[PDB]
Symmetry: C4
Subunit: 90 residues, 4 copies
């Protein structure tokens, strides 16, 4: 559980670093700095307007953006369930 | 677990083949080609703007679209839950 | 499990009957007939735009609408988890 | 289980008392009185338009609003999961 939450924070920070560099210049409101990118990736993790509000607008400039976002959603949500269920048992 | 992930991929692919055919011509931005259709059905599976942003606009042209999307949501949502729980149990 | 799904269908139909009578006249696009109301209550059960898209617009005309919608969400989602987990075990 | 449902109600009430105070004057439609604040925090807890529709507009005026809402989502989401699983286990 402790190791699970550690992995989640590292992946979240690494993903927000990547997102800042990729979309920061073209999408400054969402990815303009590390802070903004961490906030956006949390919104995306919660699945709130991820496609209609974030990813589809991002894909209009960067067609391959889904290669970042879809694996991120698959990875962070699977980890979150694993962490939530893992903490409940212990 | 592997068979579940295989079944989900097959079901997902056929669903996007069907959706391209049904809505492609009338909704090209969301279902105009297999790629776009795989992306939309993923958005639909996550439940993101599925009704307000996709299914209701689709229902304006195709009144029965709900016969496709509602069973799709029910089928994939039950499977993704079963798959994610399946990995957790088969690791404890 | 079989009894759980039976209860869910009855509550869903009864709720869609109630919604048609309550909001049908003022909100015809969402609750104008039993069919429309069943579709809307499914959208509301999945939590998609339930407040921003449906309930807040409904509350502008019917201030107490939340007394219908909030218990519905609480009831149908709890039942759905109970049914999903219940089927997985058996 | 009962203690969990009690803790959630207390946490929910205090959160809506705080939100009324912090955002009431600047966001009256969503946090203008305790009632509106209880309703908004329920919408936020379900994750419905929490960021695009509530938290980002709130962050335009109050840049630190995320310090309130993100821990709120994390706290209530973990509790609601724990409460719902808790009833299921304490019936099997
Ligand atoms: C899982 C761990 C999730 C951690 C989430 C961390 C969020 C950090 C957000 C932050 O530090 N901000 C700067 C606060 O000064 C908020 C930004 O999101 C903000 O600059 C922009 O979004 C603006 O557009 C808002 O008007
Ligand atoms: C659960 C499985 C989910 C699978 C999701 C696959 C999405 C495929 C999306 C895709 O291939 N494109 C985006 C179309 O939206 C096309 C662009 O990469 C191309 O035009 C340059
Ligand atoms: C858990 C069980 C969920 C069951 C869901 C049943 C849905 C039945 C929907 C239906 O029969 N319709 C009529 C099909 O002719 C669709 C309506 O939703 C439609 O009339 C309106 O929404 C219009 O506004 C669309 O343009
Ligand atoms: C998990 C607990 C969730 C509790 C939710 C309580 C919502 C209370 C909402 C409320 O009282 N009003 C709506 C305000 O949005 C006020 C109207 O009933 C009044 O103006 C007529
Ligand atoms: Br969360
Ligand atoms: Br998912
Ligand atoms: Br569902
Ligand atoms: Br809920
Ligand atoms: Na949503
Ligand atoms: Na959701």
């Amino acid at each position: 559980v402790g190791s699970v939450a550690a992995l989640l924070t590292v992946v979240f920070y690494i993903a927000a670093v990547m997102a800042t560099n990729l979309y920061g210049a073209t999408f400054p409101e969402w990815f303009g700095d590390l802070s903004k990118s961490l906030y956006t990736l949390f919104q995306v993790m919660t699945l709130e307007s991820w496609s209609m509000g974030i990813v589809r607008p991002v894909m209009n400039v960067h067609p391959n953006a889904w290669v970042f976002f879809i694996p991120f959603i698959m990875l962070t949500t699977f980890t979150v369930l694993n962490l939530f269920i893992g903490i409940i048992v212990d």
